[PDB]
């Protein structure tokens, strides 16, 4: 059993590939969560931005099961996101400075620690700092939210392109 983009837990407008590892956005922000979530320990997954045409954008990260599928990631209390445009961090629809932007060809890294809890983002194997600490308790799922026709690919592991050497984690694939 593999960790994949959930067929049951997605916005209908998103275009999910047959292998359930690739996703294309459609118009206004909408979301897909993975098939498996985490409750304790340190976990990791990667996202590759395959194509990001002009005006398109992504908000990538982690969402609890109640995260609104018809809204960007970071919209409500249930999720925490990292935006392609300006590297902004979002939670409860509040954008805060975090990193510089990301786009086409970039490999983004997603770390979560649920012991003080932490959310950490990586860009091409570079730790971008602690985006959020002492997060809302519950189960967290790898999550993708896309604005317009951009294409992203999710890698749950075990083999990452840029595996972090700075922190201990299990790949999301260990959930499978």
């Amino acid at each position: 059993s593999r960790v994949l983009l959930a067929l049951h837990d997605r916005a209908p407008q998103l275009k999910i590939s047959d292998d359930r590892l690739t996703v294309v956005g459609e118009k206004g922000y909408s979301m897909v969560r993975a098939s498996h979530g985490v409750r304790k320990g340190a976990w990791y997954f990667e996202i590759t931005v395959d194509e990001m045409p002009p005006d398109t954008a992504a908000r990538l990260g982690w969402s609890q099961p109640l995260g609104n599928l018809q809204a960007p990631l970071g919209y409500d209390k249930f999720s925490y996101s990292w935006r392609s445009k300006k590297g902004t961090k979002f939670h409860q629809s509040i954008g805060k400075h975090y990193s510089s932007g990301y786009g086409q060809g970039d490999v983004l890294g997603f770390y979560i620690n649920l012991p003080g809890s932490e959310i950490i983002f990586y860009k091409n194997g570079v730790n971008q700092g602690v985006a959020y600490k002492d997060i809302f308790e519950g189960v967290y799922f790898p999550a993708i939210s896309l604005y317009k026709s951009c294409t992203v690919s999710i890698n749950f592991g075990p083999c990452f392109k840029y595996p972090p050497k700075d922190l201990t984690y299990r790949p999301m694939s260990d959930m499978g």
Partner: peptide, 12 residues
């Protein structure tokens, strides 16, 4: 005519 923006749901 208004079209949905990337920052549609954002407060800040």
């Amino acid at each position: 005519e208004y079209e949905e923006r990337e920052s549609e749901f954002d407060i800040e």
